[PDB]
From a paper:
On the other hand, the estimated molecular mass of PhStom (63–234) was 44 kDa, indicating that it forms a dimer based on the molecular mass of its monomer, 20 kDa. The crystal structure of PhStom (63–234) contains residues 64–169, and it forms a banana-shaped dimer in the crystal packing. The structure of PhStom (63–234) contains one molecule in an asymmetric unit. The final model contains residues 64–169, one Na+, and 21 water molecules. Therefore, it is considered that the coiled-coil region of residues 170–234 was degraded during crystallization. The structure of PhStom (63–234) consists of an SPFH domain (residues 64–169) and is nearly the same as that of the SPFH domain of PhStom (56–234). Neighboring symmetry-related molecules with the largest interface area are shown in descending order as sym1 (N-terminal head to N-terminal head interaction), sym2 (C-terminal tail to C-terminal tail interaction), and sym3 (side to side interaction), with areas of 494, 418, and 335 Å2, respectively. Conserved residues such as Leu133, Lys164, and Val166 are located in the interface of sym2. This C-terminal tail to C-terminal tail interaction causes the formation of the banana-shaped dimer as reported in mouse stomatin.
Author numbering:
A (entry chain A), B (entry chain A): 64 to 169
């Protein structure tokens, strides 16, 4: 938990598959595990992790039905965690978990 | 617009009719129109208007399907405006409009 850092993914405004406008944010739980890769492979591993979290969130939710936002939160969180983890690995970072927090309907 | 005061209705956590948890807030647009009633009929006409806005919001949304939150926002706003206006009248206040702002799904 000590080296497990909390990242607040800035809010993402997109539309679901079934044409529903959603404002979504999330917390990323990530650990620095290869210092040499974190410091060599990218300029800034925090904001590198932030950027790809925002791009991924936008896409995963764009690719989602509203009913999945209601019923299948856990499944969506696993998709976010899978993808962001794959992304952060070249930078020596493990993503422990991803949790969608708020979901606003404007 | 000068005497039309903006009131931020504090967030209301409830469930829709079709069993959906919702966090909802709104702006109330209200005008003081009978000063004698505003000052006689109640201790504090702002917080009187706030309280009844929160109670009403909770009920109108409890009495709503999620699909009405998506599709029929305007209709829900008219219900809120009708009811809160009726409520504020004994206190010499006209409610110009009510607009649900944010709708969070926890
Ligand atoms: Na990773
Ligand atoms: Na009124």
């Amino acid at each position: 938990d000590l080296r497990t850092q909390v990242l607040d993914v800035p809010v993402q405004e997109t539309i679901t598959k079934d044409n529903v406008p959603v404002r979504v944010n999330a917390v990323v739980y990530f650990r620095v595990v290869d210092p040499v890769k974190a410091v060599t492979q990218v300029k800034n591993y925090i904001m590198a992790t932030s950027q790809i979290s925002q791009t991924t969130l936008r896409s995963v939710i764009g690719q989602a039905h509203l009913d999945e936002l209601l019923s299948e939160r856990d499944k969506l969180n696993m998709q976010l965690q899978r993808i962001i983890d794959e992304a952060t690995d070249p930078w020596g970072i493990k993503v422990t978990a991803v949790e969608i927090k708020d979901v606003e309907l404007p």
